[PDB]
Write a protein that binds this DNA or RNA. Structure first.
Ligand SMILES: [K+]
Ligand SMILES: [Mg+2]
Ligand SMILES: [Mg+2]
Ligand SMILES: [Mg+2]
Ligand SMILES: [Mg+2]
Ligand SMILES: [Mg+2]
Ligand SMILES: [Mg+2]
Ligand SMILES: [Mg+2]
Ligand SMILES: [Mg+2]
Ligand SMILES: [Mg+2]
Ligand SMILES: [Mg+2]
Ligand SMILES: [Mg+2]
Ligand SMILES: [Mg+2]
Ligand SMILES: [Mg+2]
Ligand SMILES: [Mg+2]
Ligand SMILES: [Mg+2]
Ligand SMILES: [Mg+2]
Ligand SMILES: [Mg+2]
Ligand SMILES: [Mg+2]
Ligand SMILES: [Mg+2]
Ligand SMILES: [Mg+2]
Ligand SMILES: [Mg+2]
Ligand SMILES: [Mg+2]
Ligand SMILES: [Mg+2]
Ligand SMILES: [Mg+2]
Ligand SMILES: [Mg+2]
Ligand SMILES: [Mg+2]
Ligand SMILES: [Mg+2]
Ligand SMILES: [Mg+2]
Ligand SMILES: [Mg+2]
Ligand SMILES: [Mg+2]
Ligand SMILES: [Mg+2]
Ligand SMILES: [Mg+2]
Ligand SMILES: [Mg+2]
Ligand SMILES: [Mg+2]
Ligand SMILES: [Mg+2]
Ligand SMILES: [Mg+2]
Ligand SMILES: [Mg+2]
Ligand SMILES: [Mg+2]
Ligand SMILES: [Mg+2]
Ligand SMILES: [Mg+2]
Ligand SMILES: [Mg+2]
Ligand SMILES: [Mg+2]
Ligand SMILES: [Mg+2]
Ligand SMILES: [Mg+2]
Ligand SMILES: [Mg+2]
Ligand SMILES: [Mg+2]
Ligand SMILES: [Mg+2]
Ligand SMILES: [Mg+2]
Ligand SMILES: [Mg+2]
Ligand SMILES: [Mg+2]
Ligand SMILES: [Mg+2]
Ligand SMILES: [Mg+2]
Ligand SMILES: [Mg+2]
Ligand SMILES: [Mg+2]
Ligand SMILES: [Mg+2]
Ligand SMILES: [Mg+2]
Ligand SMILES: [Mg+2]
Ligand SMILES: [Mg+2]
Ligand SMILES: [Mg+2]
Ligand SMILES: [Mg+2]
Ligand SMILES: [Mg+2]
Ligand SMILES: [Mg+2]
Ligand SMILES: [Mg+2]
Ligand SMILES: [Mg+2]
Ligand SMILES: [Mg+2]
Ligand SMILES: [Mg+2]
Ligand SMILES: [Mg+2]
Ligand SMILES: [Mg+2]
Ligand SMILES: [Mg+2]
Ligand SMILES: [Mg+2]
Ligand SMILES: [Mg+2]
Ligand SMILES: [Mg+2]
Ligand SMILES: [Mg+2]
Ligand SMILES: [Mg+2]
Ligand SMILES: [Mg+2]
Ligand SMILES: [Mg+2]
Ligand SMILES: [Mg+2]
Ligand SMILES: [Mg+2]
Ligand SMILES: [Mg+2]
Lengths: 154, 386
RNA sequence: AUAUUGGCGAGAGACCGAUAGCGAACAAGUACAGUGAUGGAAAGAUGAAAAGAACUUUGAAAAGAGAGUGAAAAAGUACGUGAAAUUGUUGAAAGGGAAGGGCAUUUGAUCAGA
RNA sequence: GUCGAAUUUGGGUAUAGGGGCGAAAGACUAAUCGAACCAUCUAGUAGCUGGUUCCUGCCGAAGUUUCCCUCAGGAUAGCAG
RNA sequence: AGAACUGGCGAUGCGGGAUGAACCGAACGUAGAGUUAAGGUGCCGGAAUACACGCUCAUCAGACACCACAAAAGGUGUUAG
RNA sequence: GCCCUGAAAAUGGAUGGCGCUCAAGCGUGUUACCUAUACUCUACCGUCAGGGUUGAUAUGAUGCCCUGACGAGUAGGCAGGCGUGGAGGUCAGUGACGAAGCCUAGACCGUAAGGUCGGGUCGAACGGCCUCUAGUGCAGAUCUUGGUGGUAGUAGCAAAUAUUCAAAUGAGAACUUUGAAGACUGAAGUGGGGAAAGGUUCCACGUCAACAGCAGUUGGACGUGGGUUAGUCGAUCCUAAGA
RNA sequence: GUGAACAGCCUCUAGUUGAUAGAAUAAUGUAGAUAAGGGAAGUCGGCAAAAUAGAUCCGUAACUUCGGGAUAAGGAUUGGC
RNA sequence: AGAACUGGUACGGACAAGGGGAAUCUGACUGUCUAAUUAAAACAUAGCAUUGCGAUGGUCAGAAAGUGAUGUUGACGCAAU
RNA sequence: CUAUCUAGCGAAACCACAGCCAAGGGAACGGGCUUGGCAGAAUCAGCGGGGAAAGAAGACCCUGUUGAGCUUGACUCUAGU
RNA sequence: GCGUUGGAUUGUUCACCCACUAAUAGGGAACGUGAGCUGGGUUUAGACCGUCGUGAGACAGGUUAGUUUUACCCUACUGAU
RNA sequence: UUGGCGGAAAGGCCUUGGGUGCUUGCUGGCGAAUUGCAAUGUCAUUUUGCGUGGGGAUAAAUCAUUUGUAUACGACUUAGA
């Protein structure tokens, strides 16, 4: 419990989270922002399309010197990617949240991703060996991912 | 300190930036000066570069070592089917430049030019000009009103013509639309010429004549990213050079503490708009006319197409303009041929050429035969046939 | 009678309070490095009590969501509190080759006094 | 370059720091050599470089004299509290 | 580069000299009002496109000291002796 | 006198710029006007000085009050205060009904050091005042230790010819197993054994959190076990340089 | 097997198929190459590259310490049956 | 070793595999060194020459020794250049 | 084969704040200051003008009443003889 | 505005000559330009010589050998969204 | 409402006719207060959403696949009911 700041009704909302997930925090943040606020089924279809390379995740913050694609046109960007690992983790959490919403008795047809936040988990540290007998860090940047899906209301 | 050895600058600073042209069809940035006593006529034409071939002609140049002698010359064949007039544009002159006032289109447009207005034609509903075609509903009062506006104003009149690539062997299927300035008198009767030519074709034999010096406006062949050695022709650095030798060694002095715009740097090469002038028309041959490649000295019943077709283009079946030498752009590319902007009288212009022989051997290799008949006569009988 | 930074047994302190105090509050002269002489760390705190989360559900699983224990799970062992750098989400605001600042007022937000 | 002898190499053994060893380069002596490494004397000394942690109030300089193995320092008088 | 006297800068902000350690004015608690200094008043820019007598036309005009340079020699240019 | 020639330097550029021609230029004169932390007056702060007032309800005579002048400041000196750890005294001080700590573009007091309050979090001690004491105040020292960024999803993961198809297993297979194919080492081997060294890595079973700079169901990994059988092979014995 | 050959190249027994991959084929690299005519004009300097190359036969100079130089230089031939 | 025939005159057909000559400076040669910027003309070398010494000795060790290296040696030797 | 694009993985140097110019003045070569020119999000591949770019308390030079290696009838000693 | 060259010798700047040419002008840009190169010279450490010094050693005297590191950041520029 | 003119950015100007309101050209009748002695004392136009009626219209682009006249990636150029 104790998710990030949410402004929705907890009685019409269902949560999912995953901690210390060994997936790139930056890619996961971009993937999360890609579906932030979307309808649940639309976001899931979009993530499957991303895995199929039919649509892309627009990289908005962590995108220096990545590369350009035409599949960022629909998001008004030139820099988009297909972070399969991040997408798979986000689908796992989306499916978990959908299961929790089904258990709680929320309408799956009205579910949208009302909150999704990715922050940095503690780094897992390895070592890389550099010229002249040097040693540098080879750390992972894992992610805490959380999301809550809420029934849309009026 | 000074250069210690003078050399001319590498490259031309007036052809900057060496960027990709904004379109595949080069813009005619100037039309011939309007002489308002001549009949109304198109000042340029649209065609497609088919390829190059070879011709033989007797050189008529008194005082030359090759006077009254035979010269072999390279020529470019530009496939030029007639262009359809589909509209008229009026231009009023303003203290801020020329300005389009209004454009009057033809009532019926072919699918060729309608394709120009669609990125995805196959899945569109083809609604283009469907409400405009109602302007000709009963007598075309609204259309004649727009034409009257062009006559009351619009010191410059241009017609909208489009190619017919269905007549070329090109796979594009989407025509090229361009404005051609109408030279000739009485701006009012410029509009009259345009209106009576709506939905009508204008052939290149009514625009260009034999021996005329014309300008070819085309986008050059693209070559992508290029290094300074070939993009600008700078000297190759010695073989001993670390970090590479296809570079410019010093790209600037310490001051100004900036790279100057005039320093050769690696970037896009080709795909530039170029206007090359003074290309002499050697043939205005007609597509319906068999023996296009025949001359008064050759007389072989042969088309201008080389054996096996123009390489990467196909066969010529329309009117074609054969210009001396080479013109910008590669095969299959749209080119605009415009009349020369000045009166050239140099004995290089004003020369009347009569072709003696046109090379129609295969360009797909070391062509040996001008026609398939010659191949059969030389080879005799083969196992497959002949 | 005098000495005593070792040993044994005691009593204390205007001393230090886990980057301090011995190197060592802890399986510390340990782990580890060096051929060797030698060098030599880091590392304390759930809770009164494990009562350390039965059971259900989603997931291949890790886990999640519940349920529950507990005074508190804003104490879940990655455990007292939980700063800053740095970061995510949300909200607000501004943004023509920096940003930040001073004086004064407009505007928006917010607020004490009477 | 050399490649059948002033050859190349394993292991054993000997030589230890102002010492060894050197077909000699101040070369090598455990990534250390114009004097190895380790611990201690040792918190070595430094007229030299860097830093030196709260506020406000009042007063407020000197680069000049003489001497100094003195000239990037000090003593002395002056200026200041 | 070295001395004499003074005033400064250093150690000092403020107004002016666009800018600037030293020049000019003026030295400073926090505010208000008035008047000024040096410097300015076409616009940037607060303040007369003020008044008055003249001079100058420059195909490199000239436009306030420190200070950001210009000379000898020349011109029926023009003005006054 | 003014103007002109004399009068040539390098990125494009400077009466500050625009621009200015009976000037907005030059010489000169007369006024009006503008504005410094300067001058005049007033208020307030502090400092210094000269004074009044112990006769009372008068507990603050370093108190209260009157008057005048003054205020720049490095190095530096002095003074009055703020804050911290611990100490004696005192408030029979605060507190599990919530101490300390921490967060708080919320409020108040002080010129300031700082102090006080409200809200949230939190869980066991802490403060005001008189005085004592010091391991007592950080922005720097290529400061010490720890932690964290931008760089940056970036450089990069390119030597040793080379992989491919299907099936099985599995949640998941480019990488595991088997089959099929294509190759290579090409006997001075990428084969088969040993010496030094390592020490269990050998082998089986289970197994994938970490490691194998991709992956992993695989492993020299992780967990649990099994395994090294001598009169003849060595050591042991001999002596060598030497100790 | 070829070959003078433990060279290089290919293969049998045995072993491995292990080096992060997929897609494109810009510049500039790294490694490997080719190039008309000229032939060191390049450059400090033929650096780098090229040319020559095995074997058999012929032929071999100056100089010489009489041993060499020497594979001097310069030529010719080479397959299959 | 030779002959005939044969072919797009190819033929050490891949692989493998000297460029050569005329000279000058320098070190005779083979060999050796600055591991990690110097491979050399530097060091060494054989040859030559000089020096000390007949052992109660020369040269050189050790703090000292009833201690050592040369020396299991003897001038055709050892030691120092 | 890279680079480049992608999936996965994923550093470092460096970093006062940062990043458009001309001139001026200025510690006499400004990204910031003054006066001008100008100036429109977010970016990708290249590139080597600038950041007086990074790497290292300049190794040259001077100073220090700081050394060390070596030399010699320096000064002062000393093993040995 | 436009051009101002090919070479022999020399690290050279400079110079000098041959030759062509319209001409073979002079200069600046951190004596432009080394994360552009090269490294011939100078200017570490090796070595040789001549002069000098008793010597260690000295020499704008000569000679030979002698590691040329990093951009992926910002800007500038070249292209591209 | 009738006709005409204006294309430099026209987007406005002129004009015919009737209808209708006002007319301070002149003369009357009624009303105003208390906004308390002032307080812009709210009278303009600029965009946006929304609701009520009326009128009018009945597409494309991008991704994905494809082309190579293009190309590092984007981008460009093509094709596909
Ligand atoms: K030394
Ligand atoms: Mg970038
Ligand atoms: Mg890159
Ligand atoms: Mg490495
Ligand atoms: Mg190593
Ligand atoms: Mg020149
Ligand atoms: Mg060309
Ligand atoms: Mg090189
Ligand atoms: Mg051809
Ligand atoms: Mg703790
Ligand atoms: Mg609690
Ligand atoms: Mg905690
Ligand atoms: Mg923070
Ligand atoms: Mg910008
Ligand atoms: Mg030496
Ligand atoms: Mg060593
Ligand atoms: Mg000390
Ligand atoms: Mg010390
Ligand atoms: Mg004072
Ligand atoms: Mg000093
Ligand atoms: Mg000073
Ligand atoms: Mg002053
Ligand atoms: Mg000035
Ligand atoms: Mg005042
Ligand atoms: Mg004004
Ligand atoms: Mg004069
Ligand atoms: Mg003025
Ligand atoms: Mg005047
Ligand atoms: Mg007093
Ligand atoms: Mg003061
Ligand atoms: Mg203490
Ligand atoms: Mg509390
Ligand atoms: Mg407690
Ligand atoms: Mg202290
Ligand atoms: Mg600090
Ligand atoms: Mg400080
Ligand atoms: Mg630091
Ligand atoms: Mg640190
Ligand atoms: Mg990369
Ligand atoms: Mg690599
Ligand atoms: Mg490989
Ligand atoms: Mg297999
Ligand atoms: Mg091989
Ligand atoms: Mg093989
Ligand atoms: Mg095993
Ligand atoms: Mg891995
Ligand atoms: Mg894994
Ligand atoms: Mg095991
Ligand atoms: Mg035996
Ligand atoms: Mg044989
Ligand atoms: Mg050639
Ligand atoms: Mg040739
Ligand atoms: Mg030749
Ligand atoms: Mg030459
Ligand atoms: Mg040359
Ligand atoms: Mg030369
Ligand atoms: Mg070579
Ligand atoms: Mg020979
Ligand atoms: Mg010879
Ligand atoms: Mg030799
Ligand atoms: Mg070496
Ligand atoms: Mg070497
Ligand atoms: Mg010698
Ligand atoms: Mg500048
Ligand atoms: Mg200057
Ligand atoms: Mg700077
Ligand atoms: Mg400015
Ligand atoms: Mg680069
Ligand atoms: Mg640079
Ligand atoms: Mg220094
Ligand atoms: Mg130093
Ligand atoms: Mg001294
Ligand atoms: Mg000494
Ligand atoms: Mg220079
Ligand atoms: Mg440079
Ligand atoms: Mg360099
Ligand atoms: Mg240079
Ligand atoms: Mg050199
Ligand atoms: Mg040397
Ligand atoms: Mg001598």
């Amino acid at each position: 419990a104790r998710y990030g700041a949410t402004s929705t009704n907890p009685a019409k909302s269902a949560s999912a989270r995953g901690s210390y997930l060994r997936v790139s925090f930056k890619n996961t943040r971009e993937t999360a922002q890609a579906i932030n606020g979307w309808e649940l089924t639309k976001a899931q279809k979009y993530l499957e399309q991303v895995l199929d390379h039919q649509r892309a995740i627009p990289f908005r913050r962590f995108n220096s010197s990545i590369g350009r694609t035409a599949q960022g046109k629909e998001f008004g960007v030139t820099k988009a990617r297909w972070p399969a690992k991040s997408v798979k983790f986000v689908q796992g959490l989306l499916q978990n949240a959908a299961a929790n919403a089904e258990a709680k008795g929320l309408d799956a047809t009205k579910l949208y991703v009302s909150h999704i936040q990715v922050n940095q988990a503690p780094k897992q540290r390895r070592r890389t060996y550099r010229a002249h007998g040097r040693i540098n860090k080879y750390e992972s940047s894992p992610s805490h991912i959380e999301l809550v899906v809420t029934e849309k209301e009026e | 300190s000074h250069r210690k050895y003078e050399a001319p600058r590498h490259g031309h600073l007036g052809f900057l930036p060496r960027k990709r042209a904004a379109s595949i069809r080069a813009r005619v940035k100037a039309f011939p000066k309007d002489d308002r006593s001549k009949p109304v006529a198109l000042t340029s034409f649209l065609g497609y570069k088919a390829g190059m071939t070879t011709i033989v002609r007797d050189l008529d140049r008194p005082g030359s070592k090759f006077h009254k002698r035979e010269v072999v010359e390279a020529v470019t064949v530009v496939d030029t089917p007639p262009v359809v007039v589909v509209g008229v544009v009026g231009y009023v002159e303003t203290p801020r430049g020329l300005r389009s006032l209004t454009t009057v289109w033809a009532e019926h447009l072919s699918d060729e030019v309608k394709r120009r207005f669609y990125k995805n034609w196959y899945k569109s509903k083809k609604k283009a000009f469907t409400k405009y075609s109602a302007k000709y509903a009963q007598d075309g009062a609204g259309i004649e009103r727009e034409l009257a506006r062009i006559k009351k104003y619009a010191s410059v009149v241009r017609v909208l013509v489009h190619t017919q690539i269905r007549k070329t062997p090109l796979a594009q299927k989407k025509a090229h639309l361009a404005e051609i300035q109408l030279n000739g008198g009485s701006i009012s009767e410029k509009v009259d010429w345009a209106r009576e030519h709506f939905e009508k074709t204008v052939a290149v034999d009514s625009v260009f004549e034999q021996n005329e010096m014309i300008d070819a406006i085309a986008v050059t062949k693209g070559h992508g990213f290029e290094g300074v050695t070939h993009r600008w022709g700078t000297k190759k650095l010695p073989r001993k050079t670390h970090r590479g030798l296809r570079k410019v060694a010093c790209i600037g002095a310490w001051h100004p503490a900036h790279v100057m715009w005039s320093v050769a740097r690696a970037g896009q090469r080709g795909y530039h708009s170029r206007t090359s002038i003074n290309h002499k028309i050697y043939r205005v041959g007609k597509g319906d006319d068999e023996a296009n490649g025949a001359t008064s000295f050759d007389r072989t019943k042969k088309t201008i197409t080389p054996m096996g077709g123009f390489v990467h283009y196909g066969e010529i079946k329309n009117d074609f303009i054969m210009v001396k030498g080479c013109i910008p752009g590669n095969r299959k590319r749209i080119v605009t041929l415009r009349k020369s902007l000045y009166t050239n009288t140099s004995r290089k212009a004003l020369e009347e050429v009569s072709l003696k022989w046109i090379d129609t051997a295969s360009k797909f290799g070391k062509g040996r035969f001008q026609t398939p008949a010659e191949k059969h006569a030389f080879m005799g009988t083969l196992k497959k046939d002949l």
